[PDB]
Amino acid sequence: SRLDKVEAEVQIDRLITGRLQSLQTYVTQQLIRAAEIRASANLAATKMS
Amino acid sequence: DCTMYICGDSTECSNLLLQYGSFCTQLNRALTGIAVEQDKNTQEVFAQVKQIYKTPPIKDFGGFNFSQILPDPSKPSKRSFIEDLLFNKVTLADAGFIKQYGDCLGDIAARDLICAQKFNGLTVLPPLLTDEMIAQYTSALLAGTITSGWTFGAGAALQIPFAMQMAYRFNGIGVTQNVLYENQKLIANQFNSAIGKIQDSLSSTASALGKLQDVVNQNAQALNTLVKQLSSNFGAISSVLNDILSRLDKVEAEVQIDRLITGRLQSLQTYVTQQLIRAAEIRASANLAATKMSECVLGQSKRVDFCGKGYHLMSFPQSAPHGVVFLHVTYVPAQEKNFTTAP
Amino acid sequence: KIQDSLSSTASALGKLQDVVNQNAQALNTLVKQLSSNFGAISSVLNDILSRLDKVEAEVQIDRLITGRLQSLQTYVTQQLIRAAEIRASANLAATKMSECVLGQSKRVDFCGKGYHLMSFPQSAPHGVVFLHVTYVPAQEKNFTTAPAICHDGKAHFPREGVFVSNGTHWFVTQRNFYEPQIITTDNTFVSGNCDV
Amino acid sequence: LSETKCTLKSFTVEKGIYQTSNFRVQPTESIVRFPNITNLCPFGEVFNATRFASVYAWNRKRISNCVADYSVLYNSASFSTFKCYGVSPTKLNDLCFTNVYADSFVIRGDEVRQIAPGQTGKIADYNYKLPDDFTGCVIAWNSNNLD
Amino acid sequence: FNFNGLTGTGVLTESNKKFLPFQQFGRDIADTTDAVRDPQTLEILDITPCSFGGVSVITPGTNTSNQVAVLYQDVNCTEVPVAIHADQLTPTWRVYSTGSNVFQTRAGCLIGAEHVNNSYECDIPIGAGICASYQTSQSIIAYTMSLGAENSVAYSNNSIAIPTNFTISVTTEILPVSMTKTSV
Ligand SMILES: *[C@@H]1O[C@H](CO)[C@@H](O[C@@H]2O[C@H](CO)[C@@H](O)[C@H](O)[C@H]2NC(C)=O)[C@H](O)[C@H]1NC(C)=O
Ligand SMILES: *[C@@H]1O[C@H](CO)[C@@H](O[C@@H]2O[C@H](CO)[C@@H](O)[C@H](O)[C@H]2NC(C)=O)[C@H](O)[C@H]1NC(C)=O
Ligand SMILES: *[C@@H]1O[C@H](CO)[C@@H](O[C@@H]2O[C@H](CO)[C@@H](O)[C@H](O)[C@H]2NC(C)=O)[C@H](O)[C@H]1NC(C)=O
Numbered sequence: 004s005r006l007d008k009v010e011a012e013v014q015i016d017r018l019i020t021g022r023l024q025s026l027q028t029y030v031t032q033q034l035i036r037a038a039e040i041r042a043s044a045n046l047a048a049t050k051m052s
Numbered sequence: 053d054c055t056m057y058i059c060g061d062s063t064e065c066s067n068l069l070l071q072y073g074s075f076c077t078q079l080n081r082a083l084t085g086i087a088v089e090q091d092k093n094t095q096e097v098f099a100q101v102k103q104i105y106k107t108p109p110i111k112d113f114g115g116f117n118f119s120q121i122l123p124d125p126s127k128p129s130k131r132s133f134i135e136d137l138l139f140n141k142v143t144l145a146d147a148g149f150i151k152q153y154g155d156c157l158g159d160i161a162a163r164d165l166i167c168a169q170k171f172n173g174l175t176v177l178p179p180l181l182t183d184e185m186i187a188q189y190t191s192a193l194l195a196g197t198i199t200s201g202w203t204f205g206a207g208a209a210l211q212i213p214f215a216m217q218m219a220y221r222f223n224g225i226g227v228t229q230n231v232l233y234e235n236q237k238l239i240a241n242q243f244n245s246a247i248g249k250i251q252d253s254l255s256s257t258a259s260a261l262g263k264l265q266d267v268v269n270q271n272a273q274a275l276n277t278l279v280k281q282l283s284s285n286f287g288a289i290s291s292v293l294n295d296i297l298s299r300l301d302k303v304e305a306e307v308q309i310d311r312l313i314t315g316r317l318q319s320l321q322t323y324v325t326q327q328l329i330r331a332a333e334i335r336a337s338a339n340l341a342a343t344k345m346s347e348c349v350l351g352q353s354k355r356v357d358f359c360g361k362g363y364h365l366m367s368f369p370q371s372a373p374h375g376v377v378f379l380h381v382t383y384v385p386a387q388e389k390n391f392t393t394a395p
Numbered sequence: 396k397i398q399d400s401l402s403s404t405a406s407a408l409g410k411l412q413d414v415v416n417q418n419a420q421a422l423n424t425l426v427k428q429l430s431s432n433f434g435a436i437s438s439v440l441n442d443i444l445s446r447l448d449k450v451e452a453e454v455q456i457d458r459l460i461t462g463r464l465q466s467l468q469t470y471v472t473q474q475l476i477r478a479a480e481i482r483a484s485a486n487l488a489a490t491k492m493s494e495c496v497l498g499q500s501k502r503v504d505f506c507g508k509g510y511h512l513m514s515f516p517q518s519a520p521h522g523v524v525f526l527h528v529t530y531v532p533a534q535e536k537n538f539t540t541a542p543a544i545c546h547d548g549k550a551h552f553p554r555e556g557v558f559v560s561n562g563t564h565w566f567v568t569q570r571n572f573y574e575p576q577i578i579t580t581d582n583t584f585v586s587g588n589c590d591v
Numbered sequence: 592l593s594e595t596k597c598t599l600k601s602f603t604v605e606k607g608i609y610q611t612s613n614f615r616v617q618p619t620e621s622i623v624r625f626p627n628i629t630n631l632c633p634f635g636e637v638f639n640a641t642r643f644a645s646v647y648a649w650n651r652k653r654i655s656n657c658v659a660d661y662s663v664l665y666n667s668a669s670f671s672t673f674k675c676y677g678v679s680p681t682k683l684n685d686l687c688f689t690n691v692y693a694d695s696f697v698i699r700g701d702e703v704r705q706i707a708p709g710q711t712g713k714i715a716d717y718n719y720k721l722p723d724d725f726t727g728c729v730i731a732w733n734s735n736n737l738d
Numbered sequence: 739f740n741f742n743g744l745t746g747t748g749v750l751t752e753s754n755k756k757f758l759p760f761q762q763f764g765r766d767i768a769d770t771t772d773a774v775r776d777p778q779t780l781e782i783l784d785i786t787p788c789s790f791g792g793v794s795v796i797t798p799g800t801n802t803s804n805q806v807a808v809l810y811q812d813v814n815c816t817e818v819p820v821a822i823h824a825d826q827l828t829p830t831w832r833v834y835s836t837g838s839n840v841f842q843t844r845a846g847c848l849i850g851a852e853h854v855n856n857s858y859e860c861d862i863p864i865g866a867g868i869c870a871s872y873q874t875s876q877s878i879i880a881y882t883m884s885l886g887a888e889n890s891v892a893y894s895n896n897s898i899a900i901p902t903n904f905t906i907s908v909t910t911e912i913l914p915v916s917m918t919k920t921s922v
């Protein structure tokens with residue numbers, strides 16, 4: 004609303020980089036939690052057999 | 053090669069990256085860790101026994117036929133018939149690990165994906181053990197488990213006639229050995245037909261080795277995504293360093309180049325992070341394969357469903373590309389009959 | 396011999412030292428990355444805040460903030476991955492303690508090469524050392540053997556052990572130690588006739 | 592060995608095998624390949640003209656097959672304004688330009704600021720507007736003794 | 739180079755690509771310019787980076803020696819001087835580009851290590867079954883790694899082997915349990 008597209012793209016690219024880094028951090032921590040849940044599910048599978 | 057990937061022969065970019073040099077030393081440290089870990093995985097799975105037992109000259113195992121799973125000299129590689137079906141199933145990204153500059157020279161560079169990776173500093177290093185050495189290790193494990201039972205895993209290999217070893221293993225699951233000595237012929241023919249059915253199922257279906265192919269595909273796709281992300285602008289006026297350095301002076305240029313440096317460095321950081329997570333999952337799988345190699349090739353396991361469904365008798369290792377295949381021989385009870393009982 | 400090997404070689408405890416070295420190096424790399432400019436005019440906040448006014452200053456400080464925050468994010472990510480590998484090793488050391496220190500394990504090679512007799516825990520810095528006592532057979536000898544034995548048109552199989560012969564006389568011995576004994580209806584059980 | 596020491600960043604190297612960072616090749620040479628053009632660009636017809644157009648009906652001229660040696664203007668022309676967008680002034684000597692167009696007109700001096708991307712005013716609104724993603728150069732000079 | 743204003747650094751080679759008359763440059767998936775048309779002569783040329791090929795240095799401890807062996811993965815030996823542009827290079831990197839200790843492995847061309855016919859345990863893993871070590875006049879040797887002692891089992895259908903003695907072995911197993919706790 005406030006800035007034209009040339010003055011706007013500097014700010015939007017700052018928001019894009021930051022929000023993309025937020026999603027990257029979320030996915031990384033989900034991959035690490037899913038690896039710990041998968042180790043627990045492999046233990047529960049062995050315990051069942 | 054960070055400098056080559058991020059800067060690609062530009063001295064001005066290299067001088068700008070000297071600010072971010074710690075991150076590249078860190079990235080290459082992590083990748084080197086992953087690589088030595090892959091070699092340690094293969095060691096831990098296959099190099100359990102350090103004696104290389106040779107297969108006995110005359111095959112007299114009591115009607116059990118191991119020709120399909122034992123190495124054949126006619127082929128140059130000492131690989132089993134089944135091992136060859138397995139190596140034919142999994143299709144790798146590139147074979148040889150030597151693509152020469154004279155091969156990538158020309159427009160073949162743009163056409164080929166591996167050339168495009170190599171021109172941006174992404175190298176695939178060859179494993180330390182060749183497939184022939186892994187085949188020799190698996191042949192040593194077969195000849196030791198066939199001729200000596202489980203004794204070669206605990207100490208010196210002590211030979212024992214194979215039918216007597218099968219009688220031991222029948223004791224191991226709660227069936228008196230007279231059962232095997234009285235059904236030697238049937239058991240051997242049932243084993244043989246089971247091996248033949250394994251071979252037929254492998255020669256028919258193409259998607260049997262799904263997990264190994266999935267590993268290969270994921271690695272290739274990770275590298276290809278890393279190459280494609282060089283087309284990203286990351287907020288710069290262009291995604292080509294030569295365009296920026298052609299159009300802008302060094303003060304107007306460094307804002308754009310620093311944008312490209314931050315973005316390409318974040319691309320490499322994401323690649324290395326996902327490789328560390330995949331290497332941790334492969335290392336868990338290699339620790340499991342090393343436990344099934346010790347606990348069910350070099351012995352008889354009492355753990356339920358650890359080695360096959362049924363009462364485990366024995367297992368045979370086969371080497372597959374980037375993996376291992378266990379042929380678990382189990383005893384499955386059959387033809388049940390009703391009876392009346394009492395404590 | 397364990398004690399002597401430990402007192403002689405200095406690089407015996409390679410894994411624990413590797414863990415310590417990796418943690419120290421991660422922290423030192425984190426400290427060194429404070430010298431990075433990240434695209435700012437300087438890597439020192441006091442220089443930027445001395446030279447530039449707050450509007451010209453915030454572009455540089457935000458560059459330093461993004462870079463240093465990414466340095467901490469990379470450190471924490473690699474610590475989470477190392478802690479997941481240490482946690483897998485601590486879960487293995489837990490099982491090994493229960494299975495081997497607190498019981499005898501029949502799992503092959505879980506606890507030493509050979510047949511496991513006992514294990515003994517020792518505490519090491521940031522780790523544990525298991526001294527696994529195993530039984531390893533030695534000094535093997537060849538014998539002629541047989542699956543069963545005909546006496547009266549019946550098959551006799553050994554109750555436990557193997558039929559071995561020193562060349563002329565047949566005995567039954569246990570599998571892991573040579574102890575020949577005279578074949579008897581105690582050592583053996585009968586099952587069916589001879590032809591099978 | 593030195594390359595390894597450099598990558599490692601220490602003066603001592605442990606036993607092992609190490610990847611290296613390619614410090615071996617330095618270019619030490621330069622190539623220039625430009626099209627074979629001989630004509631000088633029409634700096635005379637564009638910048639040294641008896642009549643410019645009105646800003647409301649501004650003139651567009653196509654420029655092609657010429658060498659933009661603007662140092663020929665150093666002798667005669669003096670520009671109060673010369674601002675380039677998407678290109679640096681010091682790089683203009685080293686480029687080949689694909690579609691050169693010259694828009695020319697005469698305005699008041701107080702309105703020269705209005706010829707720029709993203710401006711507002713009577714000129715930028717009603718007479719002549721530049722796109723936001725403009726690549727090119729704006730040149731202006733007082734012509735009180737002519738106009 | 740500078741082609742119609744496009745500046746850069748690289749090796750220029752003749753190209754097989756054919757551009758339509760309204761096209762001047764060609765790009766990759768990575769969007770870098772890989773083909774160009776020469777302005778004076780309208781011939782397509784391929785642009786190839788100059789750095790190429792992985793390079794590894796095999797060293798014993800610098801405490802032990804300052805000899806090194808260099809492994810050029812993805813170059814055969816005949817092409818080592820061409821691949822690294824050996825003529826531009828310093829004389830030292832030239833003795834390494836050719837020397838006489840040139841050995842062709844499946845991992846690449848290894849220069850500076852002596853190839854032996856023996857087999858030992860791996861000391862410095864080079865790859866594709868080759869390892870290197872500092873051995874004796876000391877030098878770096880490259881060999882095929884030994885998998886272990888060749889052995890055979892005297893198997894027959896009526897022979898058994900029974901142990902008559904034993905050893906009580908005590909072995910050590912080291913396992914990491916925890917790491918340093920840090921706070922920021
Ligand atoms: C083990 O099985 C293989 C079949 O997979 C047997 O090989 C066949 O033997 C017949 C006659 O001996 C030949 O005519 C075939 O060409 C063989 N086929 C293959 C694929 O080799 C083999 O004989 C069996 N083992 C024994 C000891 O008989
Ligand atoms: C064991 O006995 C049970 C019950 O006597 C059998 O179960 C029934 O058999 C009939 C056929 O005769 C089926 O229609 C039923 O579904 C079975 N189950 C029940 C709960 O009635 C069982 O088949 C017998 N098994 C054998 C091997 O003889
Ligand atoms: C068990 O018997 C086998 C064969 O009778 C022995 O193996 C041979 O022994 C000779 C020496 O007498 C060696 O030269 C051979 O290499 C051995 N192997 C073969 C396949 O011939 C074996 O040594 C005997 N073991 C014991 C403990 O007596």
Ligand SMILES: *[C@@H]1O[C@H](CO)[C@@H](O[C@@H]2O[C@H](CO)[C@@H](O)[C@H](O)[C@H]2NC(C)=O)[C@H](O)[C@H]1NC(C)=O
Nearest residue numbers: 538539559560561562563564565566575576577
């Ligand atoms: C196998 O063992 C038997 C029993 O120990 C040996 O038999 C005897 O030989 C000893 C002398 O060595 C005599 O004192 C016994 O009276 C014999 N007893 C019988 C029942 O024969 C036999 O000599 C051994 N054979 C070999 C080849 O070692």
Ligand SMILES: *[C@@H]1O[C@H](CO)[C@@H](O[C@@H]2O[C@H](CO)[C@@H](O)[C@H](O)[C@H]2NC(C)=O)[C@H](O)[C@H]1NC(C)=O
Nearest residue numbers: 148150813814815816817842843844845846847
């Ligand atoms: C180095 O170059 C030689 C020369 O071509 C390669 O040799 C050939 O390999 C192919 C198959 O890969 C064979 O068909 C040729 O007969 C071989 N020629 C000779 C003269 O041996 C050699 O393979 C190259 N180095 C490597 C490691 O592949």
Ligand SMILES: *[C@@H]1O[C@H](CO)[C@@H](O[C@@H]2O[C@H](CO)[C@@H](O)[C@H](O)[C@H]2NC(C)=O)[C@H](O)[C@H]1NC(C)=O
Nearest residue numbers: 531532533534535573901902903904905906907
């Ligand atoms: C079984 O092996 C042990 C060693 O593992 C033998 O004990 C040694 O015997 C030799 C001579 O027989 C002595 O010089 C050593 O001092 C003994 N060692 C110990 C620790 O006592 C034992 O004699 C062997 N037994 C048989 C039946 O051969």
Ligand SMILES: CCCCCCCC/C=C\CCCCCCCC(=O)O
Nearest residue numbers: 701702705710711712713714715716
């Ligand atoms: C009396 C003041 C009222 C101002 C209200 C605030 C709104 C501000 C926005 C626009 C007003 C500023 C005047 C614009 C002058 C530009 C005229 C030109 O470019 O040639």
Ligand SMILES: *[C@@H]1O[C@H](CO)[C@@H](O)[C@H](O)[C@H]1NC(C)=O
Nearest residue numbers: 625626627628777778779780
């Ligand atoms: C100049 O370029 C033309 C193509 O436009 C070419 O035909 C001619 O040979 C060139 N002259 C030289 C290179 O001297």
Ligand SMILES: *[C@@H]1O[C@H](CO)[C@@H](O)[C@H](O)[C@H]1NC(C)=O
Nearest residue numbers: 634635639663664666667668
């Ligand atoms: C510009 O025009 C004036 C008027 O004719 C002339 O005197 C002068 O030489 C010209 N300069 C150039 C560079 O054309």
Ligand SMILES: *[C@@H]1O[C@H](CO)[C@@H](O)[C@H](O)[C@H]1NC(C)=O
Nearest residue numbers: 603606798799800801802803
């Ligand atoms: C290591 O260096 C020390 C002195 O710095 C020397 O005394 C020692 O012999 C060296 N050891 C090796 C293995 O190079």
Ligand SMILES: *[C@@H]1O[C@H](CO)[C@@H](O)[C@H](O)[C@H]1NC(C)=O
Nearest residue numbers: 852853854855856879880881
């Ligand atoms: C190794 O053996 C080959 C023959 O197989 C021979 O040509 C070569 O010279 C030998 N190498 C050495 C160092 O003796």
